[PDB]
A paper describes a structure:
To develop an understanding of the structural basis of nanobody binding affinity, we carried out the biophysical and structural characterization of a series of six nanobodies targeting the receptor binding domain (RBD) of [name]-[name]-2 [name] protein, comprising a hit from screening a naïve nanobody library and five affinity-matured mutants derived from this parental binder; two of the mutants have been shown to be potently neutralize the virus. Recognition of the RBD by the nanobodies is dominated by CDR3 and CDR2, with CDR1 only making a few contacts. At the heart of the interaction of these nanobodies with the RBD is a salt bridge π–cation interaction involving R52 from CDR2 of the nanobody and E484 and F490 of the virus RBD. As a result of binding to this epitope, the nanobody directly competes with the binding of angiotensin-converting enzyme 2 (ACE2) and thus is neutralizing.
Based on [name]-EM data and a computational approach, we then engineered a hybrid nanobody with a CDR3 sequence that improved the binding affinity to the [name] protein. We determined the EM [name] of the hybrid molecule with the [name]. In contrast to the other structures which show a single one-up–two-down arrangement of the [name], the hybrid molecule is found in both one-up–two-down (80%) and two-up–one-down arrangements (20%). We take this observation to indicate that in solution the arrangement of one of the RBD is dynamic, consistent with the decreased entropic binding penalty. The hybrid molecule, in contrast to the parent, shows no loss of binding to the [name] protein relative to RBD. The data showed that although the enthalpy of binding to [name] was reduced, the entropic penalty was also reduced, confirming the prediction from computational analysis. Although this design approach lacks the sophistication of evolutionary selection, it did lead to hybrid nanobodies that exhibited improved binding affinity to the [name] protein that did arise from a decrease in entropic penalty upon binding [name] compared to RBD (TΔS 18 vs. 25 kJ/mol). The increase in the conformational variability (and therefore reduced entropic penalty) was clearly seen in the EM map of the complex.
Numbering used by the authors:
A (entry chain C): 728 to 827, 856 to 1067
B (entry chain A): 922 to 1147
C (entry chain A): 535 to 620, 641 to 676, 689 to 727
Write the structure that this text describes.
């Protein structure tokens, strides 16, 4: 997971919907409204920042040539499908398909297509230039020789690769096929992402549900109190409702802050992986999959990213 | 050349920091946040929270205990809630800062006290070294890195054939400008003559793909006939 | 119908827009509910046709501005609404007023959303545009070509923590 939903809430409208009697009472509580709005704004900005940090790791938008002569290696299942409406790969489509009162939802600064463009750029760089495009200028190199470097990087001589080129390519392609199969049948693979969504959804429903409560007042409806009791009694009941709803908003905001901290941790990890793993070849054990790391390929996903770690 | 480049870069750092302040946003932001969290807090003293006044002595100087108690209960509830909010926000912010600080310590270890092979952990490029500099409530690393600049196209080949056998480079890659073949280190064009001292043998030429033909010079043979 | 009104039905009140619905209430069902125990539809007590209640259009009002040190000229963003309810530009974020729509793409200065950013540029005025991810490039990949550096530079980058 990388990002959350950029939710925002009008505390005033949530507590005192279309009521003046209520709003004048709410003014007595000070800046509570403003600081809640401020916190949520902070969260939304953080989400955008997370996405930027993860994907926008590359200076230029590299693109692959029409020829796919990568020494026998097949990347059609991860490279963009130009026929499709979005510039997204087969696997990216699978991932996108395996995920499902004063409240507003702000849209993200980068759209699925921009994320896909970033991933395509990173992928093309990793393919045509290896790791040189992270250091600086992308320097072309045959894929086989790139893999020879990646072999020398794990204490295996490069003759092994050339002498076993066909086998290596076949193994790689078969593994990619297996990835397709795994993602197609079992959705549970993307739990980490789905979970996130659910949480937020819950946190919203709950919030909304907390409007239907009396909090020790005569009723949940503001208009009923206004129209039935006289002001001196009505004010007390409205105070009860306002206390309850304000407390509910505070709870929601606090939970969202904590959840945002968790997501930011995840996003920082993702950025670190895209740097040490995609843009390079990591010697940190079990940081880039169980095995001797060769390389990694990114794929976007709803509010998150996916690494395919190729290991020896 | 290297020394001059380094010194010029340091000069550029001076200029960048002197011209614009926005560079230190990460620090300033922090300050601002805290300031707000305090101002807000203070502001919440001026509120009534349903009471007849936002002042305590005024209530004490107007009402008897039986009713001053109620008003003071209202004020206390409000102010206690405000304090709880402040403390919670501060705890979360402190967690954030602690994460940042742990990162900074990791950088001072892997980057200053050493030379990291982690990518983009210690600046855009191949990490050479780093130098720390203090700053209010934070630290600033100057990462010195090696960035290849001038690049040239060359024909290449994963190996060559000399006597049916296949020669691979020990440290580097085979290249050709169009006429002659060489072997050179990948990170810098330093072409050398292809020999048995620069290469090692494995198998033959009926396996490798993209293999080519050229002559490998053996330094030993001329020494003998000489 | 089709207007923001303050409605009062048999036992309930609210503010919203009443529209002809496609729902199928039972003969005894009067007012519909959402997932979040929210009233979404009603049955008119006099005429037995069903009406959907849509909340009256609302949303944030944000100001886009360069530094006052530069200019006092600004733009306005009405969030998640339509320009109808209000040099105009409709976006996934809402209605943008005071900023010129431009085909040219630049790097983002002031983010708005859904790939739209804005900035103050040359005579001078505020402009909105789809932001540029970067300069497009193609690498000359061939199975027998390699680029090797003949030179280098020493870069000094500042990281503040
Ligand atoms: C790689 O394997 C894939 C299996 O998906 C094949 O790619 C197909 O290529 C054919 C033409 O060769 C196209 O009609 C299909 O649209 C492609 N399928 C997809 C979904 O990409 C092919 O066997 C290999 N392709 C490459 C580039 O090597
Ligand atoms: C090394 O193990 C691999 C298993 O991955 C073997 O490669 C297989 O070769 C058989 C026939 O020799 C083919 O049917 C398979 O398609 C290959 N496997 C894959 C997944 O491509 C290989 O034979 C083994 N080599 C040694 C030394 O026995
Ligand atoms: C390698 O690149 C560097 C950086 O451009 C070159 O060093 C500069 O050379 C120019 C003119 O030759 C001088 O004006 C600068 O003073 C040098 N840079 C610094 C700050 O030292 C160098 O000439 C290049 N070498 C090659 C092979 O062309
Ligand atoms: C490719 O680089 C080398 C530079 O060393 C050139 O190869 C030389 O060719 C000349 C002319 O026949 C010989 O006398 C030298 O012995 C060769 N040098 C070595 C050490 O191989 C070659 O000319 C260059 N090609 C081009 C197009 O400039
Ligand atoms: C290196 O030279 C050998 C020797 O000529 C080449 O081997 C010939 O390959 C052709 C087709 O490629 C065959 O028709 C001949 O029978 C081969 N000759 C012999 C006697 O082996 C080889 O192609 C060359 N390799 C490269 C890299 O060009
Ligand atoms: C009450 O008077 C209204 C006013 O016309 C009538 O509304 C009808 O409602 C019935 C069912 O509620 C519908 O089948 C008719 O189409 C409505 N007629 C019109 C012209 O609106 C109706 O006479 C009375 N409704 C009831 C409850 O009997
Ligand atoms: C290599 O030649 C290609 C022609 O396709 C060109 O795009 C590239 O800039 C050249 N690289 C260098 C700078 O040697
Ligand atoms: C390199 O590619 C060209 C065209 O794609 C092809 O004719 C040639 O056989 C390839 N060489 C190798 C290394 O197989
Ligand atoms: C306004 O911008 C100018 C141009 O950079 C600068 O010199 C000046 O310090 C700025 N003034 C303020 C109010 O910061
Ligand atoms: C905005 O209004 C126009 C015309 O009033 C209408 O065609 C369009 O469907 C509306 N768009 C949205 C976002 O509802
Ligand atoms: C953008 O291009 C479209 C398509 O031709 C054109 O109708 C429109 O006038 C252009 N807008 C601007 C800002 O030039």
């Amino acid at each position: 997971p990388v990002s959350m939903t950029k939710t925002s809430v009008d505390c005033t409208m949530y507590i005192c919907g279309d009521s003046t009697e209520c709003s004048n009472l709410l003014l007595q509580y000070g800046s509570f409204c403003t600081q809640l709005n401020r916190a949520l704004t902070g969260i939304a900005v953080e989400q955008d920042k997370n996405t930027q940090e993860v994907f926008a790791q590359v200076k230029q938008i590299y693109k692959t040539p029409p020829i796919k002569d990568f020494g026998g290696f097949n990347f059609s299942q991860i490279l963009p499908d130009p026929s499709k409406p979005s510039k997204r790969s087969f696997i990216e489509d699978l991932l996108f398909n395996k995920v499902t009162n004063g409240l507003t939802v702000l849209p993200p600064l980068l759209t699925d297509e921009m994320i896909a463009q970033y991933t395509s750029a990173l992928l093309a760089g990793t393919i045509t230039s290896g790791w040189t495009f992270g250091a600086g200028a992308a320097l072309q190199i045959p894929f086989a020789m790139q893999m020879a470097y990646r072999f020398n990087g794990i204490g295996v001589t490069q003759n092994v690769l050339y002498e076993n080129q066909k086998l290596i390519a076949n193994q790689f392609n078969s593994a990619i096929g297996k990835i397709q199969d795994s993602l197609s049948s079992t959705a549970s693979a993307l739990g980490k992402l789905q979970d996130v969504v659910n949480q937020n959804a819950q946190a919203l429903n709950t919030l909304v549900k907390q409007l239907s409560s009396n909090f020790g007042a005569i009723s949940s409806v503001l208009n009923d109190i206004l129209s039935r009791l006289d002001p001196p009694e009505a004010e007390v009941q409205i105070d009860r409702l306002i206390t309850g709803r304000l407390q509910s908003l505070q709870t929601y905001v606090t939970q969202q802050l904590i959840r945002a901290a968790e997501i930011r941790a995840s996003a920082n990890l993702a950025a670190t992986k895209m740097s040490e793993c995609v843009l390079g070849q990591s010697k940190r054990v079990d940081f880039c999959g169980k095995g001797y790391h060769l390389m990694s390929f990114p794929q976007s996903a709803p509010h998150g990213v996916v690494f395919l770690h190729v290991t020896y | 050349l290297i020394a001059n480049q380094f010194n010029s870069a340091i000069g550029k750092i001076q200029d960048s920091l002197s011209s614009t302040a926005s560079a230190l946003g990460k620090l300033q932001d922090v300050v601002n946040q805290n300031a707000q969290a305090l101002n807000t807090l203070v502001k919440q003293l001026s509120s009534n929270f349903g009471a007849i006044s936002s002042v305590l002595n005024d209530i004490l100087s107007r009402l008897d205990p039986p009713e001053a108690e109620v008003q003071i209960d209202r004020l206390i509830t409000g102010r206690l809630q405000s304090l709880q909010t402040y403390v919670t926000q501060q705890l979360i912010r402190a967690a954030e800062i602690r994460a940042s600080a742990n990162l900074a310590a990791t950088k001072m270890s892997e980057c200053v006290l050493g030379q990291s092979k982690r990518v983009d952990f210690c600046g855009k490029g191949y990490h050479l070294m780093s130098f720390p500099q203090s700053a209010p409530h934070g630290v600033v690393f100057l990462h010195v890195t090696y960035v290849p600049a001038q690049e040239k196209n060359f024909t290449t080949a994963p190996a060559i054939c000399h006597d049916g056998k296949a020669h691979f480079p020990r440290e580097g890659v085979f290249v050709s400008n169009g006429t002659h073949w060489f072997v050179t280190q990948r990170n810098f064009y330093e072409p050398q003559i292809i020999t048995t001292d620069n290469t090692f043998v494995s198998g033959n030429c009926d396996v490798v793909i993209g293999i080519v033909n050229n002559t490998v010079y053996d330094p030993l043979q001329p020494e003998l006939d000489s | 119908k089709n207007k923001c009104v303050n409605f009062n039905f048999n036992g309930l009140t609210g503010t919203g827009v009443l529209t002809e619905s496609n729902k199928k209430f039972l003969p005894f069902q009067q007012f519909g509910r959402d997932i979040a125990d929210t009233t979404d539809a009603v049955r008119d007590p006099q005429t037995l046709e069903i009406l959907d209640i849509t909340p009256c259009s609302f949303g944030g009002v944000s100001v886009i501005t360069p530094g006052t040190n530069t200019s006092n000229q600004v733009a306005v963003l009405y969030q998640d609404v339509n320009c109808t309810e209000v040099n105009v530009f409709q976006t996934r974020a809402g209605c943008l007023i005071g900023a010129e729509h431009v085909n040219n793409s630049y790097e983002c200065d002031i983010p708005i959303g859904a790939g739209i950013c804005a900035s103050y540029q040359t005579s001078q005025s505020i402009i909105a545009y789809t932001m540029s991810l970067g300069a497009e490039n193609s690498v000359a990949y061939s199975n027998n070509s390699i680029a090797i550096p003949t030179n280098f530079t020493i870069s000094v980058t500042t990281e503040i923590l």
